[PDB]
Amino acid sequence: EWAVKESGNTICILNSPGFIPPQDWDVLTDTISWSPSLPTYVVPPGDYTLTPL
Amino acid sequence: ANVWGVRLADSLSSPTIETRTRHYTLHDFYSDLDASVGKEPWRPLRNQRTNEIVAVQLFRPLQGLVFDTQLYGFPGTFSQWEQFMKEKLRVLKYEVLRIYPISTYNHDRVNVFVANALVGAFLSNQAFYDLLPLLIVNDTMISDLLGTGAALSQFFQSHGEVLEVAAGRKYLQMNNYSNDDDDPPLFAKDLSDYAKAFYSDTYEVLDRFFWTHDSSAGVLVHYDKPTNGNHYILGTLTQMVSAPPHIINATDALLLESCLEQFAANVRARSAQPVTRLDQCYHLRWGAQYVGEDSLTYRLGVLSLLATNGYQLARPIPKQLTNRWLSSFVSQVVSDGINETPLWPQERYVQIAYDSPSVVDGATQYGYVRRNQLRLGMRISALQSLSDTPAPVQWLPQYTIDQVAVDEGDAMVSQLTQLPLRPDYGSIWIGEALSYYVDYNRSHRVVLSSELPQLPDTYFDGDEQYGRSLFSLARKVGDRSLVKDTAVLKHAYQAIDPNTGKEYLRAGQSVAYFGASAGHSGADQPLVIEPWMQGKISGVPPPSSVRQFGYDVAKGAIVDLARPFPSGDYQFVYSDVDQVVDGHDDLSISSGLVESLLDSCVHATAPGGSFVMKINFPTRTVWHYIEQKILPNVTSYMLIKPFVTNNVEVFFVAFGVHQQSALTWTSGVYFFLVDHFYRYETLSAISRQLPSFGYVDDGSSVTGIEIISIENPGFSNMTQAARVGISGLCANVGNARKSIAIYESHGARVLTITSRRSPASARRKARLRYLPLIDPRSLEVQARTILPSNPVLFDNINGASPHVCLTMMYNFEVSSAVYDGDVVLDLGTGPEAKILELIPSTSPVTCVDIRPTAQPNGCWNVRTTFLELDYLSDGWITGVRGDIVTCMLSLGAAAAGKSMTFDAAFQQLVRVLTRSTANVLLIQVNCPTDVIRTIKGYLEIDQTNKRYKFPKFGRDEPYSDMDSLERICRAAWPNCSITWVPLSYDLRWTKLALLESTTLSSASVRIAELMYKYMPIMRIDIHGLPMEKQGNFIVGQNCSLVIPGFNAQDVFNCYFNSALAFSTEDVNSAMIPQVTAQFDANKGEWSLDMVFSDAGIYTMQALVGSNANPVSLGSFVVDSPDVDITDAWPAQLDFTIAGTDVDITVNPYYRLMAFVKIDGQWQIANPDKFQFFSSNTGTLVMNVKLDIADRYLLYYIRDVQSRDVGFYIQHPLQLLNTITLPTNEDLFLSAPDMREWAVKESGNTICILNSPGFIPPQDWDVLTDTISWSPSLPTYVVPPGDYTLTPL
Amino acid sequence: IGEALSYYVDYNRSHRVVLSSELPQLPDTYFDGDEQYGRSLFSLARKVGDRSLVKDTAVLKHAYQAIDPNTGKEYLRAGQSVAYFGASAGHSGADQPLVIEPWMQGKISGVPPPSSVRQFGYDVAKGAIVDLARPFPSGDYQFVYSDVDQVVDGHDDLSISSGLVESLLDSCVHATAPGGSFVMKINFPTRTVWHYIEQKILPNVTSYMLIKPFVTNNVEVFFVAFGVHQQSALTWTSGVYFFLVDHFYRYETLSAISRQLPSFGYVDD
Amino acid sequence: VAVQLFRPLQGLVFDTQLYGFPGTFSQWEQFMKEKLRVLKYEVLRIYPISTYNH
């Protein structure tokens, strides 16, 4: 699990059970991650850092 | 080859390497008597069914128990027996040590006969001390044991110079042995006197001895590494009764066990892995006279001869044998048949074929002879072991050049079938229930009640009742009333009052549920009431209260709703009172009941409310009464039908009751009712041909399940019985899915083939002059077990894929386009010819393909040719002739393969067809009939680069506009007469889906229609009147038409989905907004200036005049207005009760409202949140009433003016998400989602919105009515300074 | 013990043209008692787990790394329709070959998951059973994978095996998409098979590659061809010659070494 | 408390005590299963299914 962190906020958890992606995000079928199973999202302009676990 | 109902694999295998023999030593004797945990001289045998130990196997030191089990006194339980034997052997080992110390005697050899005799004597408490001096070997076992007389004559005996040793028990059974079905086969070796062994150094001396000794029971010699020395095994009269059907004496038991062991070794043999001995089978040397000619001993000798030479069973052999398997094997062996194998047993020697892979001939000096002349032309390999398949696997037969008479095939199919049984009827239709609705429009033409259609006259008859009952029974939905009520409420609440522009029904209304009843489920009320009260349904806000009136109601009161009854006024009446209860089985009385219920609903409702009623049987009298009485007293009306089963019923919704107004029926209502009746008629016609729900199939019905079974089948040498039966089944089925299964039943192995019939299958079968024959190689190969399953007619649990529905629509159109006796040329076909199944059997074909076809060619009633050529190439089309040309789903794929634009490939095909002579052309073209839009997930298309993309299948095809195609056709051929066939809104194509065993889902059908909208079928008829159209064909614009061929005083009728758009005689009575038409005199071209309200495909047919013969002309398409939406927000944002006003530009044709995407479903935005008013060319239809939660929700503006939501306008509100939150004034807030939503002020969190314990802060203010999409979610008013939210 | 090793060669435009006559051939003494014993011993004492899974993973990882000489793309893309000729349910784990599940769920790094997999073979438990040598009613696919052996439908004669190789090759070429690719397994490579490869396949394909995952010493090799049904001028290269010579030499030396070992379960005297 | 007999097992015309049924459903089921298995094996012995299948 990874924690996506917008400036001053915790948006969501990448691989938590029952994870609901934010509405503003957009999902693409490219899946350009190294593992094809993991998806890839398009994000609003504000997105800064991630924290493990 | 088959021996007697026993199937043998075509491969041959045998072990190759012999491991050398250990010589038994005294240290090994001590180790065996230690009974160590790893080296215990026994192995438990467990019952397969219950995994309980019932018998044990005795190894070398424990062999020789020759007395009755009562004398030994074994405990009878495996653990206690193990401990007792361990103690006994431990006691004996110490005595053996005492006489023979291990310090001195370590490598001295041990007489195995003396060891076994000593063990058996000690266990039987009988004079063991005499054998101990004879334990060590001096010269030879037989020489040292001959003439001694030291032990009892029961163990071993001396007959001159041959030593006779009794054979001890190999298996020992415990008390749990009950001759069960799955118990191990003991092979009669658990008795004391099953066999005797005569040991000698030379075989000649044994033969001389047996010259005088009787051999009535027959003697078995082994010839391959005997256990101790050259010996003869003479059987006894003891028999084995464990296999229930058959009783077998000792000799047959020994032969059976040896054959099974050798067959298992042959199956599991490897090149590198060696075995103790190559040959496991005993050989019968003496006793041929007493053995019967066709007894079990002779057959078992043949099987042993086969096993030695390298044959191997086709059926799998379990690792541990069972009684059922042995009984089935014996029953197979003693079945009927002949031995095709050239091998025949002889008592002189064991015959080894020249091609046999077995190498036992070299190892053994005497006893085996290899015959050079005898040959077995079979390959050498070992079978691969496969796990048993729980379910039958699909099989695809392949045909050959041989042909048989059809009558023989039919007779053998009848003989071999298991046809009479009860199939498990499946659900023909699944999925959610789509709805069709129409709304009142001011601009539409005034329509009198006289021309509205009725229900069909034959509605109440046995056939239609049967059809609708079958359709209702087969449909798989839950709580039809629930889904219908939800659909009608969702569609009714979205209505907008023309006055004040707001909705008709708001929150807090008081509703009355007429006709409520206690359903089968333990709810005692309609299912929709509780979610409606709790606000679960997104579209509808909860009402104030619900009162239920009906005959069968439980919570409410029971009344007669027709007569006046004591009840207070209500401001929304929802009635579902069935008209059959008091209809007295008369239609006029039903109409009178409808009128009475209308009067009751009008009286009950409020002066400003509304009411809804279900009309069970529509008719002209009902429409006339409505128009005459109630329409003047209402403001707007709504017709909605939710489709769950085929019925003509419709739900009527009227708004603004008790207010004077001028209303009338509109043309939209006429179109809706016409299409509804047409759909009901075609669905009933399709459904009437299906069998009963619980029928018993016997081949009479056109549709059903066809099953045959072959017991003990023979595939290596087909007897022209099973082959003909399977070929007849394949012909009857006619290119459908076939499942095979091989399993064990009642002592035999049976093959089962299951498939389904269809009317198309019968049509294909009618074309067979001779019955083709299959190639049984694939079934011959299968040396495994496939368990059977119960048959199901509609085996498709889920509905068919949209691509399947699309290609099936194409197939149905192709089949309907061809008349009897018309030669047709099919340009695109795969290896299997489905075109040969659709067309009538009278008309010939000429199939052109780029790949080889698997269909047989020799036997066909009419001319059927398959050509291995590419059709896009030229120079070949001249020879062939064809009246009708079909090319489905091939032109675009071929263009993509050669990497050319669709225009070039289409033109090339046109030139190729021009080099030929064909009146009618059917071409599948990739052109957009309507505005270019993308079907997400199934067909995504980009206007740039001119290409199509199919996600699920992964291919891509080019596309081009239809105008280029029309230009090409009219340039190449004058009088092209283009006709685009209406097929999107027609439901007749479901005949192939439903008559054949295939299940349909509503969503798949919808996706198929939307896909077909962009991939039409272009039908080109040469020698036809060319209709010329000028300008653009879009709704709301004038279209001019030119028809030069026809003369004056002619009639033209335009049709729109089985509905008459207008007629030339009565331009005033045109259903479309405007029709104007002039002959134009000398030019001879009628000019028709007309405008269409709704987009689609319209077909022109013309009557010649002064005659009753109509003539079909070309068709045309009308496009929808361009979907371009531009939204401009004001500079300032107002957060009061009056939301910001956003002016947008949208064509007035489209009706639009907001939707919310939550989880995987689409939710309707709250009616009070968005209010669209002042609809015009410029629309001030945006009253947002902004919210704090809007920063985390994306609102989509969809389109709801058509039968399908969206697909025309889906505009995200990106500017809505990015809104500046003021610090000066208060702000509304609501819970974004059911999940816990922490609310964050400046630097702190004040509370959790959806915590289990939630207490709102005292500063907040709660509105009377909510603004969130879910009505159950309240709305608060925070003081200035509350900005952000965080999940959980 | 250990994992599987993969040796691969690829078509290179700069290499020299080599005809089929100069290519090495399968040894004449391949079908002999001692050679069969040695190779069976090596297969029996290999301790590899399951051979099919590792071989398929290696060949797929090497196949998806193939670039397109035109447009500079990858021949194999996600969502392509695939077929698995010769599926077997012999193994205890699953009815379908174990390679399908990681391929479908995308667990394997190299291969993106495909849209759908259809299985054809004599021993298949999920798909239909057919005779692959003769025409069968199924349609076209973008990617065709074939692991059907040459010993069942082909008798012990080698010429019949070569003819069966040619027939399966024709079936695969007919069953593949106009712009797709296919994978073929050659159980017994020989000079006539190479000549058929060249003369038939190479004019009609855009690129090819020879791969062999090393799990057991034998002449089994994997042939993959990209850009099928596209006119091109292709021929054998020197790299293929070197790869074939090294393969044959390695098999010869390993078989000769393994022929001197005792059988699997033996008594030592 | 009771069972219903279908097309087979419908010839029981003698006294209930002559059959010696266990009197409990599970034991009755086991007893009748074994008796019917014995009768089935007999009728298979005299009538093979490979000849009189249909």
Short mmCIF file of C-alpha atoms in Angstrom, two decimals, chain B residues 483-719:
data_model
loop_
_atom_site.label_atom_id
_atom_site.label_comp_id
_atom_site.label_asym_id
_atom_site.label_seq_id
_atom_site.Cartn_x
_atom_site.Cartn_y
_atom_site.Cartn_z
CA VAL B 483 -38.53 -2.84 -11.05
CA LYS B 484 -41.62 -1.58 -12.88
CA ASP B 485 -42.51 0.76 -10.00
CA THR B 486 -38.94 2.06 -9.76
CA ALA B 487 -38.82 2.72 -13.51
CA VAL B 488 -42.17 4.52 -13.63
CA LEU B 489 -41.36 6.61 -10.54
CA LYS B 490 -37.93 7.56 -11.90
CA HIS B 491 -39.44 8.63 -15.22
CA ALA B 492 -42.38 10.46 -13.63
CA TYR B 493 -40.40 12.48 -11.08
CA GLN B 494 -38.13 13.94 -13.79
CA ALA B 495 -41.08 15.70 -15.45
CA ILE B 496 -41.10 19.51 -15.52
CA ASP B 497 -44.19 21.69 -15.22
CA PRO B 498 -44.48 24.09 -18.19
CA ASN B 499 -45.65 26.72 -15.70
CA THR B 500 -42.93 27.96 -13.31
CA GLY B 501 -40.56 25.56 -15.08
CA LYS B 502 -40.21 23.42 -11.95
CA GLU B 503 -40.94 19.74 -11.36
CA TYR B 504 -44.48 18.47 -10.83
CA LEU B 505 -43.69 16.30 -7.79
CA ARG B 506 -41.54 17.57 -4.92
CA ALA B 507 -40.38 16.21 -1.58
CA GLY B 508 -42.87 15.67 1.22
CA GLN B 509 -45.80 14.67 -1.00
CA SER B 510 -48.60 12.48 0.34
CA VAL B 511 -49.10 9.39 -1.81
CA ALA B 512 -51.68 6.60 -1.98
CA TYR B 513 -50.83 3.15 -3.36
CA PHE B 514 -53.98 1.75 -4.95
CA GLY B 515 -54.13 -1.96 -5.63
CA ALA B 516 -51.36 -2.87 -3.19
CA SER B 517 -51.08 -6.57 -2.38
CA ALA B 518 -49.07 -8.85 -0.11
CA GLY B 519 -46.51 -10.53 -2.35
CA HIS B 520 -45.14 -14.04 -2.14
CA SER B 521 -42.17 -12.81 -0.10
CA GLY B 522 -42.78 -12.13 3.57
CA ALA B 523 -43.09 -8.36 3.15
CA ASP B 524 -46.91 -7.90 3.28
CA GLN B 525 -46.59 -4.80 1.06
CA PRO B 526 -45.16 -3.71 -2.30
CA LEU B 527 -41.37 -3.88 -2.32
CA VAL B 528 -40.88 -0.33 -3.62
CA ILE B 529 -42.50 1.39 -0.63
CA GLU B 530 -39.74 0.93 1.96
CA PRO B 531 -36.79 2.16 -0.17
CA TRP B 532 -38.98 5.01 -1.40
CA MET B 533 -39.73 6.06 2.18
CA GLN B 534 -36.08 5.68 3.20
CA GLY B 535 -34.83 7.56 0.14
CA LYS B 536 -32.79 4.65 -1.20
CA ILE B 537 -33.80 5.40 -4.79
CA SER B 538 -31.63 8.27 -6.01
CA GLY B 539 -34.13 9.75 -8.45
CA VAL B 540 -37.18 10.08 -6.21
CA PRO B 541 -37.28 11.97 -2.89
CA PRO B 542 -39.19 10.27 -0.07
CA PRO B 543 -42.90 11.05 0.29
CA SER B 544 -44.65 12.16 3.46
CA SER B 545 -46.73 8.99 3.91
CA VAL B 546 -48.14 6.06 1.94
CA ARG B 547 -51.68 4.72 2.31
CA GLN B 548 -52.53 1.42 0.63
CA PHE B 549 -55.93 0.46 -0.79
CA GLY B 550 -56.53 -2.82 -2.57
CA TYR B 551 -58.28 -6.16 -2.50
CA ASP B 552 -55.22 -8.08 -1.25
CA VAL B 553 -53.59 -5.37 0.88
CA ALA B 554 -52.32 -6.24 4.37
CA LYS B 555 -51.16 -2.96 5.93
CA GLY B 556 -54.00 -0.89 4.45
CA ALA B 557 -57.73 -1.33 4.06
CA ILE B 558 -59.55 -3.53 1.55
CA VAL B 559 -62.10 -1.73 -0.64
CA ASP B 560 -63.82 -1.96 -4.01
CA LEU B 561 -62.00 0.81 -5.87
CA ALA B 562 -64.51 1.13 -8.72
CA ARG B 563 -67.39 2.17 -6.48
CA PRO B 564 -67.07 5.36 -4.40
CA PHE B 565 -65.52 4.64 -1.01
CA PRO B 566 -64.74 6.68 2.12
CA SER B 567 -61.25 8.11 1.76
CA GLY B 568 -59.58 11.48 2.18
CA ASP B 569 -57.99 13.43 -0.62
CA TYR B 570 -54.41 12.73 -1.71
CA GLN B 571 -51.98 14.71 -3.85
CA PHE B 572 -50.42 11.73 -5.67
CA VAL B 573 -52.27 8.52 -6.55
CA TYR B 574 -50.33 5.46 -7.73
CA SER B 575 -52.63 2.65 -8.87
CA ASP B 576 -51.82 -0.83 -10.19
CA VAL B 577 -55.33 -2.30 -10.07
CA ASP B 578 -55.56 -5.19 -12.52
CA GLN B 579 -58.62 -5.01 -14.77
CA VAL B 580 -59.07 -8.80 -15.02
CA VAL B 581 -60.50 -9.26 -11.50
CA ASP B 582 -63.85 -7.64 -12.36
CA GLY B 583 -63.57 -7.88 -16.15
CA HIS B 584 -65.82 -10.98 -16.34
CA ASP B 585 -63.58 -12.20 -19.20
CA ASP B 586 -65.04 -9.55 -21.52
CA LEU B 587 -63.09 -6.78 -23.23
CA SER B 588 -65.88 -4.18 -23.18
CA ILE B 589 -66.37 -4.73 -19.44
CA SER B 590 -62.60 -4.30 -19.03
CA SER B 591 -62.79 -0.96 -20.86
CA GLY B 592 -65.68 0.08 -18.62
CA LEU B 593 -63.61 -0.88 -15.58
CA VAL B 594 -60.76 1.23 -16.96
CA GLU B 595 -63.13 4.20 -17.28
CA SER B 596 -64.44 3.67 -13.74
CA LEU B 597 -60.90 3.51 -12.35
CA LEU B 598 -60.07 6.70 -14.27
CA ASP B 599 -63.04 8.43 -12.64
CA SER B 600 -62.03 7.14 -9.20
CA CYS B 601 -58.44 8.31 -9.63
CA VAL B 602 -59.60 11.73 -10.85
CA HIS B 603 -61.89 12.12 -7.84
CA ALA B 604 -59.30 10.89 -5.34
CA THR B 605 -56.42 13.11 -6.45
CA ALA B 606 -55.86 16.66 -5.23
CA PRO B 607 -56.94 19.76 -7.18
CA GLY B 608 -53.25 20.27 -7.98
CA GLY B 609 -51.84 16.73 -7.82
CA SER B 610 -51.30 13.92 -10.29
CA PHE B 611 -52.10 10.24 -10.72
CA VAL B 612 -50.75 7.12 -12.44
CA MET B 613 -52.62 4.00 -13.55
CA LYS B 614 -51.65 0.81 -15.37
CA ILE B 615 -53.82 0.05 -18.41
CA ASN B 616 -53.90 -3.72 -18.89
CA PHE B 617 -55.60 -3.86 -22.33
CA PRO B 618 -55.35 -0.70 -24.46
CA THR B 619 -58.07 -0.10 -27.04
CA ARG B 620 -59.57 2.75 -29.06
CA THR B 621 -62.49 3.19 -26.65
CA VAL B 622 -60.08 3.90 -23.79
CA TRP B 623 -58.23 6.52 -25.84
CA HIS B 624 -61.50 8.13 -26.95
CA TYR B 625 -62.79 8.31 -23.37
CA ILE B 626 -59.49 9.75 -22.12
CA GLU B 627 -59.39 12.41 -24.85
CA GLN B 628 -63.04 13.34 -24.33
CA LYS B 629 -63.04 13.54 -20.53
CA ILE B 630 -59.69 13.73 -18.74
CA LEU B 631 -57.27 15.35 -21.19
CA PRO B 632 -59.02 18.77 -20.91
CA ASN B 633 -58.68 18.54 -17.11
CA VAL B 634 -54.92 17.84 -17.04
CA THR B 635 -51.84 19.85 -18.00
CA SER B 636 -49.51 17.12 -19.29
CA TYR B 637 -49.54 13.36 -19.77
CA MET B 638 -46.90 10.63 -19.92
CA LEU B 639 -46.94 7.11 -21.37
CA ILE B 640 -44.31 4.66 -20.06
CA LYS B 641 -43.86 0.96 -20.63
CA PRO B 642 -41.24 -0.98 -18.76
CA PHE B 643 -40.49 -4.20 -20.58
CA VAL B 644 -40.18 -7.29 -18.45
CA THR B 645 -42.41 -9.76 -20.29
CA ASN B 646 -44.38 -9.50 -23.48
CA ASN B 647 -47.67 -7.81 -22.75
CA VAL B 648 -49.48 -4.92 -24.32
CA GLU B 649 -49.92 -3.11 -21.03
CA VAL B 650 -48.82 0.49 -20.60
CA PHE B 651 -48.70 2.86 -17.64
CA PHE B 652 -50.47 6.16 -17.96
CA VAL B 653 -49.21 9.23 -16.12
CA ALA B 654 -51.12 12.52 -16.02
CA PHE B 655 -49.99 15.77 -14.40
CA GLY B 656 -51.76 18.98 -13.45
CA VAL B 657 -55.17 17.40 -12.81
CA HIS B 658 -58.31 19.44 -12.05
CA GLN B 659 -57.02 22.39 -14.11
CA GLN B 660 -58.66 23.41 -17.37
CA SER B 661 -56.42 23.03 -20.42
CA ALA B 662 -56.48 22.18 -24.12
CA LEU B 663 -54.70 18.88 -24.81
CA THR B 664 -54.85 16.19 -27.48
CA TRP B 665 -53.01 13.10 -28.64
CA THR B 666 -49.79 13.76 -30.55
CA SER B 667 -48.00 11.94 -33.35
CA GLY B 668 -45.34 10.77 -30.91
CA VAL B 669 -47.96 8.77 -29.02
CA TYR B 670 -49.05 7.18 -32.30
CA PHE B 671 -45.47 6.20 -33.16
CA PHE B 672 -44.83 4.85 -29.66
CA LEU B 673 -47.97 2.71 -29.65
CA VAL B 674 -47.31 1.43 -33.18
CA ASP B 675 -43.78 0.33 -32.30
CA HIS B 676 -44.99 -1.17 -29.00
CA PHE B 677 -47.64 -3.27 -30.75
CA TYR B 678 -45.19 -4.33 -33.47
CA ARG B 679 -42.64 -5.41 -30.85
CA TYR B 680 -45.26 -7.39 -28.93
CA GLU B 681 -46.45 -9.10 -32.11
CA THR B 682 -42.97 -10.11 -33.27
CA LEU B 683 -41.97 -11.28 -29.78
CA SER B 684 -45.11 -13.41 -29.49
CA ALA B 685 -44.52 -14.88 -32.95
CA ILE B 686 -40.94 -15.78 -32.02
CA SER B 687 -41.90 -17.21 -28.62
CA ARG B 688 -44.79 -19.36 -29.89
CA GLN B 689 -42.35 -21.80 -31.55
CA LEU B 690 -40.51 -22.78 -28.36
CA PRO B 691 -41.31 -26.01 -26.46
CA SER B 692 -43.02 -26.22 -23.07
CA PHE B 693 -41.34 -25.35 -19.78
CA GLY B 694 -41.14 -28.94 -18.52
CA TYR B 695 -41.48 -30.92 -21.73
CA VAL B 696 -40.14 -34.40 -22.45
CA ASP B 697 -38.21 -34.31 -25.72
CA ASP B 698 -38.67 -37.13 -28.24
CA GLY B 699 -37.50 -35.47 -31.47
CA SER B 700 -40.91 -34.09 -32.45
CA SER B 701 -40.10 -30.48 -31.58
CA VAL B 702 -37.96 -28.44 -33.96
CA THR B 703 -35.91 -27.18 -31.00
CA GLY B 704 -34.58 -29.46 -28.29
CA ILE B 705 -31.67 -31.49 -26.96
CA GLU B 706 -30.32 -34.43 -28.98
CA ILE B 707 -28.28 -37.05 -27.12
CA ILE B 708 -26.98 -40.48 -28.14
CA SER B 709 -24.94 -42.99 -26.16
CA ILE B 710 -22.61 -45.75 -27.36
CA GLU B 711 -21.73 -48.51 -24.89
CA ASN B 712 -18.29 -50.12 -25.13
CA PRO B 713 -17.46 -48.05 -28.22
CA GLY B 714 -14.95 -49.09 -30.85
CA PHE B 715 -12.89 -46.39 -32.56
CA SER B 716 -9.84 -48.28 -33.85
CA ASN B 717 -12.07 -50.39 -36.14
CA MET B 718 -15.44 -48.69 -36.52
CA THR B 719 -18.23 -51.21 -37.09
#
